[PDB]
Design a protein around this ligand. Structure first.
Ligand SMILES: CCCCCCCC/C=C\CCCCCCCC(=O)O[C@H](COC(=O)CCCCCCC/C=C/CCCCCCCC)COP(=O)(O)OCCN
Lengths: 258, 140, 144, 131, 258, 145, 144
């Protein structure tokens, strides 16, 4: 009983202090003195490597998922006379489940792995320890502008993923296979409604932006300062975010959509 | 320190995120649990709503069956806000729209100038109507 | 360099604004809310009416439905509806019918006008109401 | 080698315009009329009006007048179809099961179409069969 | 401008062409040669743990999250016609055509794709690949060859676990929760799926996606610079290039077979 | 070794009690836990779209399933197999079986109609009063001719 | 090194048990049966929406499929093939060929009727047939 059979230990005390270390990392980086003019060039500088550089893997991949949504939405509606409802399948899928979940997996892959590697390289070269010595807090210097950049980028990148994926379905649905444009957009404009498809797409995009950025900034801060600890925390960022985006996707659909 | 300062924050943060999922998963007013007796429920099942006047007033808990009578029984529940119904209230199974889900309906009759409480049973009922016996008795 | 980071941020905000306008024009949002007055009417069976049900006179929607209330005395469905200020000239001889949009669509609260002339104002009832008939009494009345 | 780097630069740009020409190839005025329909049904804007079967135009935004409470069913027939006689009319035909309907002197400018045939709703059509 | 824009675009054209030339020579020098089935037999099972066994945790608990979301979204839009005999189609058909081998590949490129890049890149910085070729057989057929064959076996095998759990995960929101008479759930879902359209065709996409993911995951760790920042840079490029190779080939295989 | 005695063991009891979920098809109700059913037989003329695992219901409450559909090699008639549980035994010989449809894609089920009292049915009898399924090709053609 | 060999055996066992969940519970591919069937020949005049792999049936239970449907370019008559297995080889010569529909929105199948005796063998044609239902002629004959 005292050995590793029942009271094995290092599982209730361990992996619970890391939750307390992640809570103190976000509370001390968001609650403080208001410095708006100081963090104003830091927010624009940290918006290029978070929102602008992650726009490459969304535009060219938005037409990839948007075209296969129109390919698979054609042959399954042949014997049901649902050819005029071609935008019924493309728009409703890319606004409820596809979209804010698929872009969060691309945000955790590109921007999530880069934020872990950036803070992890600063602790390996002791940049955060040297910044702390010169009478300033390293928490509200590099973590706080990186958090607010990743929060406002993912809803601003989801609407790009939606509009490209809808246009990706228009290049394979309206141009190809001969479907009328008057019958296509009538199944999208006055068919779906507000507060179920538009607001709820932006509600879950904010909560996915907080959870991915909190994981990516904690693994880069709570890591071993060596050459193998940065590569280990980069792998654990994608694992912990894919189980948090897909895990909360079943949680967030309890209230909305029936 | 590093051990005492970070052990109590993880207690409150894990208890706040776990309690946020308890509220989000819809885990949160009395009824008097009426009982009925039909012969063909049709597409009725558990968690089916009961309506009067088109809008719903409650839900059906479960559908049981007695082995001595071999008839389906309903365990519907209507709340305390609507009580003044007579004993001649007819129960009818209606469909929401054309191909929607089926629901119960309370056809309130003429009140003679008794109320239903815990343990009562609606006498006048009308079961669901299948589309098999109607066409077989019309085009024949 | 330094000048490459400042320009590409504004292009990212412009591309996100044009992608949001594609949802504000070519999606469920078609436009870019004046207070109405509340009516009251008693029915017998509203069918499948819910919140924000469209009210139309001839086909053009003139308002929504706030909530569905009930009577604690006679147990009859009381529906509240809102008409705009521009559509004010409505007589008392009005049939409040409940029809559906097509065959499998959602139900809409229909309304038609009918020609000492009293018109409807804020806070009055309508005596001519047409209840939504369920599918049960259509085949049963056709046979009997 | 700087000489071989600029030699392949014009070779890749010649294939860029050829690969982009196959994707851009697949990616007239309208004079307005008038209609005085009573029951428009479930007809909305941007509906394909096919008088005879082939589409000729669309439908503008519908609204009710404050005088007689009647919807405006103004139309957008373009210039390729203009030899239509004045003894024509329009009819509201449905298409599908969701309720999406469509429509079917000189008429160059300001043509009030007479002999209006409104959309017969099925909720009132069952009263004729029952009574 | 004519001598400057053509020289800058011409410099990136040769470096792109030299990138594919080094990837072709790395795969050709790792598959052919003398048969070493008796020496690579303890090396293949050792590399089957961090590729197939360690990536089973990211698929099993996420498999019940895919089917619970897909089973709940595909129910309330099918109640307008018939609640019974639903959720057998549009769940098992979707998890064998688009979902399945695409979704498991983003979990394979994030967990196992980013780990195989960081493992070869860490051995290159610590001088392990150069030390092996200076005394023994070169590590192209010693550490790269068991890591390439382990990815083309585990990812077709892990897709079957992702399908069968996600099918059972869709049978939890339909059975014992808003039940749809689960006797109708079977003996009609089997009539929709068949061989060489849904079962064998799912295995075709699994073998193709396993090659294009493990090729970039073993090339970015081999072509990275031996430093602390080159391993973290090649780890980010592995998730980027594999997401464009899975979603890019998803349009290729859908228009060819379906 | 001081705090890993009872402050950690309360997480083991909390995870063991939360390690159980609802499972009607994984490992509980499919093979091990079942109900005792007796085998019945019924000979039909046209079953329509009747397949395996179809519910046999009296009014709508499912009391059994359907095992398989076999054909006799002498008269070529479909013979279904019933899976009525032992909780409902008082079934007379005057019971009739009616194949009713439920849906629009040709999904038919067996609606058992109990009789009024006779003899109690046992394991391995055959009900004679069987009704064929409704076909749309004979429904519209009877109205015209 | 024993930990890196046992867990691989559970990984190949869990991947094998996932294959039996698809090949048995999610589909029926457990038997190949080496195709024990024989083809026939038939000629209709209007097959309607009869497509490939059309399951023919005797009394509702499904056995036998349709392999090839061709059009004979001599008098514009379509020719279909039925592929019942070699088990129920007692078919009377008075058997007809009717085209039925599974319910309302199902697939269009072929129903075999039992007639009142030449036993049909491999390589013959069915004389007595029956066409499908035409939707434009019932609405024209109803008002005529
Ligand atoms: C009665 C027959 C019905 C049809 C049966 C055959 C259907 C076959 C469909 C399967 C093959 C095509 C699959 C296409 C891809 C589907 C994937 C998908 O839908 O998205 C899912 C989730 O599903 C959704 O996105 C929600 C879709 C909501 C659909 C809303 C209804 C659409 C209406 C179309 C039908 C129109 C109904 C009107 C009646 C007319 C037609 C009868 C993704 O889940 P995630 O967890 O986000 O994945 C993360 C990793 N990528």
């Amino acid at each position: 009983l005292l050995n590793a059979l029942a009271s094995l230990g290092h599982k209730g005390i361990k992996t619970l202090r890391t939750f307390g270390r992640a809570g103190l990392m976000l509370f001390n980086a968001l609650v403080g003195k208001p410095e708006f003019r100081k963090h104003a060039p830091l927010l624009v500088r940290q918006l290029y490597n978070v929102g602008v550089l992650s726009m490459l893997i969304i535009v060219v991949s938005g037409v990839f998922i948007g075209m296969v949504l129109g390919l698979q939405g054609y042959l399954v509606l042949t014997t049901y006379s649902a050819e005029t409802s071609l935008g019924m399948l493309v728009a409703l899928s890319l606004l409820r489940e596809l979209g804010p979940v698929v872009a969060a997996l691309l945000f955790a892959g590109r921007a999530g792995s880069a934020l872990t590697a950036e803070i992890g390289l600063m602790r390996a070269t002791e940049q955060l320890s040297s910044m702390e010595m010169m009478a300033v807090d390293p928490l509200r210097r590099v973590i706080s502008p990186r958090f607010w950049a990743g929060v406002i980028s993912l809803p601003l990148l989801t609407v790009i993923f939606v509009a490209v994926g809808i246009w990706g379905g228009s290049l394979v649905g309206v141009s190809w296979k001969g479907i009328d444009s008057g019958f296509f957009w009538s199944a999208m404009q006055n068919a779906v409604d507000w507060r179920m498809d538009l607001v709820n797409c932006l509600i879950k995009s904010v909560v996915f932006a907080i959870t991915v950025t909190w994981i990516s900034l904690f693994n880069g801060y709570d890591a071993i300062p060596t050459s193998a600890g940065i590569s280990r925390a980069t792998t654990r960022t994608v694992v912990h975010s894919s189980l948090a985006v897909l895990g909360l996707d079943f949680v967030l659909t309890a209230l909305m959509f029936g | 320190q590093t051990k005492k300062n970070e052990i109590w924050v993880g207690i409150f943060l894990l208890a706040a995120l776990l309690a946020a999922l308890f509220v989000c998963l819809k885990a949160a007013e009395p009824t008097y649990t009426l009982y009925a007796t039909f012969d063909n429920i049709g597409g009725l099942k558990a968690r089916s709503p009961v309506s009067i006047g088109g809008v719903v007033v409650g839900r059906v808990a479960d559908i049981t069956l007695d082995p001595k009578t071999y008839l389906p029984r309903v365990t519907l529940e209507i709340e305390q806000r609507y009580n003044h119904i007579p004993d001649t209230s007819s129960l009818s199974i209606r469909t929401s729209g054309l191909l929607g889900e089926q629901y119960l309906a309370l056809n309130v009759g003429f009140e003679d100038p008794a109320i239903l409480k815990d343990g009562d049973t609606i006498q006048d009922t009308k079961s669901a109507m299948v589309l098999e016996d109607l066409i077989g008795q019309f085009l024949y």
